[PDB]
Design a binder for these strands. Structure first.
Ligand SMILES: [Ca+2]
Ligand SMILES: [Ca+2]
Ligand SMILES: [Ca+2]
Ligand SMILES: [Ca+2]
Lengths: 196, 202
DNA sequence: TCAGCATCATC
DNA sequence: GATGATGCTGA
């Protein structure tokens, strides 16, 4: 389906719905018949809207989720009406949708809530993925060296001055360790690195 | 399967933990996880969050920072949004942000439900061959200090490396295999253990 | 030999 | 998450 930027393609059955009317006062809706999903947010990303009556009716809604899931060129987002009436049927739907099919699931209480949430999704979809806030080792090396038995804040920097990487420190003989620490601590360090 | 539980969840999710223990064939280990609520596989963390805390936008920043810290350690993240014992723009924005970064979201009505979701996640992780398959403590503390390594990856290191020296001289591919981590993660660990320390850089 | 150093238990 | 009280380290 062709979805121009800043537009939502909606299934014709949504015409005159509160959902469509609330969206149409914020973003351009294009209506199209013969569509499996309820809305397309982009060419490849679509919405499958599961009503309170679908959820209470049984598992018939699953057939469509499977049909979209098995589409190579499409990513389905499931938006479900989770209300006082439907909520007992929600847990089995979430298991199937998210844990079985691996599809995104979003509950809403109402078409009014869905409208805000769908706009948020278009807004997310439209920005540069780099504006998604989710999309020097020396102080750490000191702390790592401090985990070696016998080695505190004073011996750690002395050890790293002479054996400058973990690998090199790991390979040091007792004789070489004895250039930096005493025999007891040289023995602790070496045992720490080499014991099974 | 095995799930690791952050010690701090004994305060906030006592019933999650007892519900987990009530599931036959689940090994439940509570551990000092440092922030992580649940570890459900070698590669996946779960953040349990109250819905009323997700709804308030003064928490939005702290929540984002906790997810950033989780991304530095784990390849996969799930958020479970749990109802406490009106829906906002901040909340919607959080949900979509999570979706854009591929963070999985689940919705729970109670602590008993959360446990059942955690169990289900570990079962699915298992079938993806990333199940936790491991049970000295000095060596664990050492591995745990490697930056951006998870508690499970550190435990894998303890259990699969016959000595600490053997681990420090491991190739990139050995770290990846024995620590059970992505190529990217094994590279970061390899670079750390090879990093040439220079004092004047402090 | 004796401060220096690491360590951890107790604020 | 900090002292600092306690006993090992070390040439
Ligand atoms: Ca037509
Ligand atoms: Ca130490
Ligand atoms: Ca010496
Ligand atoms: Ca939490």
């Amino acid at each position: 389906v062709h979805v121009p930027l800043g537009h939502i393609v909606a299934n014709e059955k949504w015409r005159g719905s509160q959902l469509a009317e609330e969206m149409q006062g914020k973003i351009k809706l294009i209506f199209e018949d013969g569509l499996t999903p309820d809305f397309y947010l982009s060419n490849r990303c679509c919405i499958l809207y599961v009503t309170e009556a679908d959820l209470v009716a049984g598992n018939g809604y699953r057939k469509r989720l499977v049909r979209v899931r098995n589409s190579n060129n499409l990513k389905g987002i499931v938006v479900v009406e989770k209300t006082r009436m439907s909520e007992q049927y929600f847990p089995a739907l979430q298991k199937f949708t998210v844990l079985d099919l691996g599809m995104v699931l979003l509950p809403v209480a109402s078409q009014m809530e869905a409208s805000c949430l769908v706009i948020q999704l278009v807004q997310e979809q439209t920005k540069e993925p780099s504006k998604n806030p989710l999309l020097l080792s020396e102080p750490s090396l000191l702390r790592t060296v401090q985990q070696i038995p016998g080695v505190g804040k004073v011996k750690a920097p002395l050890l790293l001055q002479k054996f400058p990487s973990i690998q090199q420190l790991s390979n040091a003989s007792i004789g070489e360790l004895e250039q930096v620490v005493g025999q007891a601590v040289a023995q602790q360090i070496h045992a720490f690195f080499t014991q099974p | 399967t095995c799930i690791l539980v952050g010690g701090h969840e004994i305060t906030s999710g006592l019933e999650v933990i007892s519900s987990l223990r009530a599931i036959h064939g689940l090994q439940v280990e509570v551990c000092p996880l440092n922030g992580c609520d649940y570890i459900v596989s070698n590669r996946m963390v779960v953040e349990r969050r109250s819905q009323s805390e997700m709804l308030n936008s003064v928490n939005k920043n702290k929540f984002i920072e906790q997810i950033q810290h989780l991304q530095s350690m784990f390849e996969r993240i799930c958020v479970i949004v749990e109802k406490d014992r009106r829906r906002t723009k901040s909340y919607d924005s959080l949900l979509t942000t999570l979706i854009g970064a591929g963070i999985r979201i689940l919705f729970s009505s109670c602590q008993e439900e959360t446990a059942d979701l955690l169990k289900e996640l570990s079962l699915v992780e298992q079938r993806k061959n990333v199940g936790i398959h491991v049970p000295k403590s000095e060596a664990l503390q050492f591995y745990l200090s490697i930056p951006n390594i998870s508690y499970i990856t550190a435990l894998n290191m303890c259990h699969q490396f016959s000595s600490v020296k053997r681990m420090a001289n491991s190739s990139l591919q050995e770290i990846s295999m024995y620590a059970q981590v992505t190529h990217q993660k094994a590279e970061e660990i390899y670079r750390y253990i090879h990093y040439v320390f220079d004092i004047q850089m402090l």
